[PDB]
Design a protein around this nucleic acid. Sequence first.
RNA 1: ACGAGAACACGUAUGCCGAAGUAUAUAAAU
RNA 2: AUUUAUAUACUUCGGCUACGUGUUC
Lengths: 205, 205, 107, 117, 117, 218
Amino acid sequence: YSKIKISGTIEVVTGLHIGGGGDSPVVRDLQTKLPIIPGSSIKGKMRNLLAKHFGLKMKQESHNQDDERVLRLFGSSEKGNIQRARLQISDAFFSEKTKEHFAQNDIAYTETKFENTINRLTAVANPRQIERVTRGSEFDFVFIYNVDEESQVEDDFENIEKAIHLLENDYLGGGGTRGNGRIQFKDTNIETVVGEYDSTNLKIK
Amino acid sequence: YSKIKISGTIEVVTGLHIGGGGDSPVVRDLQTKLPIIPGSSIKGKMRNLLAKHFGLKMKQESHNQDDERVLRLFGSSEKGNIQRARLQISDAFFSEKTKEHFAQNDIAYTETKFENTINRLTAVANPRQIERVTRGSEFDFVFIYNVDEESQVEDDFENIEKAIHLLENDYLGGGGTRGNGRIQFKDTNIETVVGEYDSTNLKIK
Amino acid sequence: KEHFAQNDIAYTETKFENTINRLTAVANPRQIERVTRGSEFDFVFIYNVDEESQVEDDFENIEKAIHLLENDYLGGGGTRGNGRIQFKDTNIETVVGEYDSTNLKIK
Amino acid sequence: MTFAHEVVKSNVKNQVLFNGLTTSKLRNLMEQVNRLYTIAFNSNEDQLNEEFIDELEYLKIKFYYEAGREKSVDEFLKKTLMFPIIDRVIKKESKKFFLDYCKYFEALVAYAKYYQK
Amino acid sequence: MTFAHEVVKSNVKNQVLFNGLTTSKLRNLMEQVNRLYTIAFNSNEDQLNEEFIDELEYLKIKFYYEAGREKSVDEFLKKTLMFPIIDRVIKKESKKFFLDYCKYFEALVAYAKYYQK
Amino acid sequence: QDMREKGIGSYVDREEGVKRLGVVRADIDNLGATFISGIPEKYNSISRTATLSRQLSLFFKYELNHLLENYQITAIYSGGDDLFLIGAWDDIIEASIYINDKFKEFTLDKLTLSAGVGMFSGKYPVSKMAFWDEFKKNILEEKLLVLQQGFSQTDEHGKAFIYKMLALLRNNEAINIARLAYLLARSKMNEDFTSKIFNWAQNDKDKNQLITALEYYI
RNA sequence: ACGAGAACACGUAUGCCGAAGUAUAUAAAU
RNA sequence: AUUUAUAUACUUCGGCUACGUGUUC
Ligand SMILES: Nc1ncnc2c1ncn2[C@@H]1O[C@H](COP(=O)(O)OP(=O)(O)OP(=O)(O)O)[C@@H](O)[C@H]1O
């Protein structure tokens, strides 16, 4: 029995707006008054994209069942052949190095870029202001992967690489189709934090 | 399943005043502090124009519900229906060649044209300072085309190229009726980023 | 308690969540209550040595258990990103009897 | 404290609002206070930053200048006593009281917004 | 720092402003400072550019020339001590202090604008 | 549709509110004297004591059966001076008030009822499940109806908005009151609803009644 | 030699969906 | 060489924790 830890940083290519508070603020840790990326959001988008990559049928659309590999990697425990999740996502916190950079260069942590709404036949505008983390900021995340079985490890990491690759060409947060919330992954590290399984041959881009 | 990347550059033919943050400045980043074209503006312009170019009834004009192909391409999902936007329109960034061009030509990043308000039969003037992105500026943009159904890629890219053309013959931003907001598209490249879909016979002007 | 009272910090947060219906893509909201990050809890373990020749093995096992727990979650939704904990300021003190408890460690 | 509500009711004269004051005359005003609202809500300690003191001074700058432009703005800024409360905030260096002033002005804005032609 | 406010109140004499100074006499002045305001607000580092040093010199040129034209301009530019503060800004090569001077002059302008005939 | 007796879940599975259970216990407070003291000095005959006892027995053994016919409640212990009804949370409260009024009619407002109702989750050991005018007129009739009409006319305001209302109201601080003023400014109700709610929150008795009513809503 | 003893309120799922910071009024008179 | 200095309208609208399940041998 062993566990594999995945570490890295998520850079916001453009404005990210998680904004679970609902004006229209962003989720903040109440210990440091900072915007965060909840892990469950990351894991849900990975789930959705990876499921859509593999078979996703009408009858599969009905029930939130999905391909055996996706269910195996993310766990269902809903009907009959239940599978305990092998992969645990953690939250992301606004890193310390970006603390230093935005302190030294006096850069705001959250823009308020206004938007509008031109409805038709009246053309009357309607204004709104939303908050989104500033460009270029980085967040630190950590993953933990369980090996309940020995042989499958390579395939699961292949699927993880595929999921990350798809997610890098998509959005987190909201308004993604409208420009917000693009990210890229960088500075990844894979290490066996507990156990006796090697991981030098395993890579996630 | 696959994704298709639409990349290129937008040059700016006359003044550009997005002014989303607003003497009345323009939208500007806060990591490097250069003006940007919010993807929301790109999407709003493209949607409104391509929608109006085909049919637009008063009942259609009522509540932002339009013909089936726009509602497919840009996504509505309110009328008890399943549809997500098939284009991911991102933000635009003032490219590096423009950086170096204006840095080594000692040309400002933005003009500041002054305006006036001549009142009728009163001839009293009301001043006005306004700011705009200079001519010749170029930004880089990316669109991501998700492929949901195999059989509609060709027609959707025909509609996308018509949208690009009609936008090229129209303005973008604010105060477009007074001569600022003209853009033009060039250097379009099409690549398949994830999957096994072919992107050879596909062109955009 | 002193730190949060000084800094005027609510004891417990409330995160908002959703869920996506497939073929429908209509989200039904969700409300969950979560203990604030960075709080500290006080814990005490009592061990009753009944066999002399087993204390080292037992404490090795309990260290292994702590090690796994540090790399796992407590409570609910652990795969969703909550419950990660950490252990600090651990001391080992014998309080009844005459067994030396200075060579035992728990990190 | 709702004394703002009382003054606004006392300011509906026979109708006009503050004798020619409109909510859009207040644009620069609430924009400045909200901008300061963000920069202060980011802060941690109640002991105010001293560029924050400079920013409050700049806010008082905007106040006199708006008063200089328009007579209705002058009447509004004088009777409802923005000016001593800003002075005492500058004298006190307290963040929570700064947000108290913020909700004060926002109360004025909202009540006036419902209290219009 | 509001000592500008104090001097402007001390300069309302029995009424006239700086003995014949008008805000429109200041046109070229605030135009130059605002132009420099833009070119500096574009910059990134606090270490000033050296054509920016040249531009500050040119600003001092405008100061000495405006003073030469009008006596009221001379009195204004001398008492409220534009001139040492420009000298120390030239000596210091600091951007943030340049914007501090900018807000200073704008404070003068706004307060005078509200303090008029 | 099924005549066979069903389990506790038949009442738990109601979708009109939280899937819980309601329980009511009642005793005549002035009963010891009633059987002992009776009608003083002129009608304390064995005959009249017998009549009094039988009339109480008939009330607590017939009328309840007819009264309960419009409630999703099941009669458990009835008789003597003890009344035990179990069912849906809303139906238990409504039946408790209605039976209280009906009893006040039968005793012509001479005997009163002392009762307590709690909420517990389904299939809890019923053993441990078991171990007036103001509430009707002010809470159930006035504030509850106001809140129901307002929440039915204005959408998007679910348990989250009401729970923020609760967080502001339970922590009785003026900062919560100002926050609630802003929240009602932001809310999209008729101005009458907002004004009434805020002014109720400003009074301690009215804030307690309001929180009770809105807790009943969910 | 305590109505005690074993026993993770636990497992699957997000703040999403659509919305253009718009629409008007010449840096002028001697 | 002599007066303005951004002006009035709108400052988020629509639509509001489901299931395995409570208890014992
Ligand atoms: N229908 C009836 N006829 C005659 N006696 C009755 C009848 N119902 C109840 N009683 C008697 O009246 C007595 C009342 O005592 P009990 O303690 O149960 O209620 P209580 O004294 O009224 O309690 P509390 O005053 O706390 O409400 C009981 O001992 C019971 O035997």
